[model samples]
Target: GSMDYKRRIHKFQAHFGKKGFEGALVAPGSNFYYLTGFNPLGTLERLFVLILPSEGLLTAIAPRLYEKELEEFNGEVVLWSDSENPYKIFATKIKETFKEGEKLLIDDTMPVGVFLKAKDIFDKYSLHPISPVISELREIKDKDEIKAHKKAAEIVDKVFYRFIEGKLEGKSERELANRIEYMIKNEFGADDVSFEPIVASGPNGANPHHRPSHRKIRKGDVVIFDYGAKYLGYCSDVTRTVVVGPPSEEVKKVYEIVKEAQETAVQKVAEGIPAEVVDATARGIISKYGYGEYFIHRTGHGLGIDVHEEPYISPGNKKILKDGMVFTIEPGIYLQGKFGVRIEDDVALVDKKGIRLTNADRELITL
Candidate 1:
């Protein structure tokens, strides 16, 4: 509804007003759709740009093609012909929108060429990334966003179990990864796979993010499954390590440490705790087991509109854990070039407890 857009734009305007940024220029992608329900997906320098001012109507500088796409679009729009330079149209929107101030916030995805083209005015006006303003607005998941994520999580869960139980045996790493991607889209009804599936096996798992290769799956090898699904524009990420046959004593030890680290961090998550504290919880578990150096990466990462976003759960990040924030708690042990074990869960903090969005069985699933 146009009314909804008005309210959302008002929020952005309010942020600009609070920060004293006279106006902002939004680029194409999530932030663009976040402000207005339209994205002119293109590679052109000024394919689509949004002009937002602290005061006045929100304006979108659009290309002629998508001009009609937003038939019921809520905000004001200005279109430029292909022969005409879009920068002029965008500049006109900005000039008319806010002629007084020298501060402009810009979308981080904005093309450098477009900004450089208008360097003359910006040289004096001073431009800044609209990250903080837009990021703050996007960090919290609304009911619909949470639902989208839940549905996405369900899809990936089904795909994971189905792939493992039905077709995992006797397949190469790359082939299995392809199968996961196929199921995510065709069977699970996801718009796309969140990212390429990682099907690292045995020694490959030591890299933490080993890309799926042609390595054959064999008995007794610990295989790390990391993949996700994107549905209704939201995302879900999950990872579990499984052994095809009997696991070695050494593999069991590291796998248990990774699992404990992830669970402890998930337990630490609640409203008001610091992100770093949760990271410490996971790190403490793994470090106590004497594999501190192997747990190389941050404990987890914020995921939503983008697979990686804000409120990063890592050391030194003081961002407070808040209700409605969604992320993954993935603690891993990487004995580089030998093997890696990671157990991950997509979690959402509610008022009292954190809900695990990724529903796959975290238990060691042996084929």
Candidate 2:
């Protein structure tokens, strides 16, 4: 309905000359897909590349196999062959356009192997990373991006309650994770799971990013679910904890504290507020509860085209929150070898207040 790629390409073109860059080289990655709707899968040894110059039509050098697919590409397509050396092919083409000391910006997500070829190609010219320029631009979401993120979050939240309403008394952590992936991938409209989904129970919950184990869940155990779903390249992440049976006094205590902290921090998310201030808002509450050391990681992170992208919500970021900037506000406390409780919600900043995309319910769901 909208000319998204064209608009993005225009932004890409406008930044080149301002940054003293004569051109840019983007390959098969998020930034590449963001600029163009094409996904090259993998470059392997063959080159699948796009060259965006500050002043001329964009040019792409790709394998012959992809020629048909590249036919609709907005610019010229120079096909490479198995017999020809694609490295020198690009290097020579680059030299013909730019003189000595001319600068070119390369996507940061590009691999180091590609970087070697880039350095050799720009032997006499200056080569720089395009991270700073693109990172800032991707931080703020447009209407379409916000819509994709909201849909992704909505599906994940719905599947969560559905799974909880079914089974889990003696299921293994691995089984729980499998069930989650199945529900989101099949029943729901998720294109993919944003990450490998975490299902930590009891002592396992103490370790953040814990891989699913065969350990069976037990009564009185608090399980931590940290998961996300993807929709049309956008991502949504969320986390919540539930007790299998009656929770211990300590379990009930941490859950309430973490919930209060998450709500307090979310209220602080409005335009013009510093990211660190929002982080501090949550951290202060947990610290006041005498679990300062237990709050190990940052408050949260950015969410968008990738599971974790821009506008990182952490200590000392100092970056001002702006309208259309969406990120995660997750606060947790872990008592080692005992249990852990985390309440996470995805929120998008607006002029008036922060709107939660996930609409997570932190209520006690005792199984």
Candidate 3:
């Protein structure tokens, strides 16, 4: 375990050195876990911080309560007793390690309040945000990471089929959503739902991010599901819009339009292309159909350890797509007071190819 953690830390140290940071200060969370195979609960009672110097050493600071836990970690542990202030103790240790004006890179997710407290102790230190570096490092998926995401997508696709075949007949939206969760957890054996399964039907479907309600499934009503499954710390997100019965001419038209938009968007997701291009590819289709404004959010977002990560697929972002970057390509059209249609799939950019992970049918599923 220590070897695995050490290898990652060494890699990060190399990156920090190249980036010109004298050292990095990582809080206990995903960033910490990414660099060191240890996952701290990040409880208020016990805070953990890591200090990594460019060419010297890596150190971990923790509350005395986690003395045993830190002992198992790869780096040297600096413990602070409850009787004393841990932040001040940690700052003193860092000051002792690095000289004044040395650049210190810290996690962006670190609470501003915590940073303020640390600032009082190290007012002369040069502190900088390290989000860009960390996000760039985490955006690309390694082999193990891709494998976990693929498995999670497969599980989510299976659960979708279960929801439609077994639970979609006459159940209320809330009940259907609950059943999907149960199948994913008890039967499908998923660690958890990536997020709450959105089981919106009819008018509720028009609300893009609607929560499941008591609204029952009805003939001729449209149902939209935006859901995902989480397994082994990775998440899979997929959305499918289905009609309870034979869709009316208008409904079918909207569905076809949205589906085509989504297809075009996914097709444009090759490596080296700008992320905004993907969003425009989809948004262009919707706009041509006069539903442009109805598409309120970004086409989709990057997915992996976090449901929403970096390199967002949106019109405002100009980041070039890179290989091993996995994200969602969901194009949706929501007509208020009418209905909505959304088709989503997990996609990965690899060697200029777009690979779709979720294999569920995208054609309008008329039940």
Candidate 1 stretches greater than 4 Å from native: 1-5, 43-46, 120-122, 187-189
RMSD of each: 2.4, 2.1, 3.0
What TM-score does prediction 1 earn? 0.92
Alpha-carbon TM-score of each model against the true structure: 0.92, 0.93, 0.87
Question: Per-residue lDDT tens digits of candidate 3, residues 30-74?
Answer: 787677766666465456677778655677776777777655655
What is the clash count of model 3?
0
Stretches of candidate 2 off by over 4 Å are 1-3, 68-71, 81-84, 117-120
* Best-matching candidate per TM-score: 2
Residue 2, model 3, lDDT = 17
The deviation in Å at residue 120 for candidate 2 is 5.0
- Quote model 3's TM-score: 0.87
Best by lDDT: 2
Over the stretch 1-367, how does candidate 2's per-residue lDDT look in tens digits? 1327776777767766556678678888778777776777656777777877775577778787877767687876877777777777766576565777778788777676755766655577677888887777678888888888899999898988888897787899999998888888884458788888889998988888788899999888899988889877778999989999888888888889999999999988989889999999999999999998999988889997787878888987999899889899998998889988888999987665799999857886899
The lDDT values for all models are 0.80, 0.83, 0.80
Q: Please state the error at residue 162 of candidate 3 in Å.
A: 1.3
TM-score of 2: 0.93
Off by over 4 Å in 3: 1-8, 63-71, 78-85, 91-94, 169-172, 187-189
The order of the candidates by lDDT, greatest first, is: 2, 3, 1
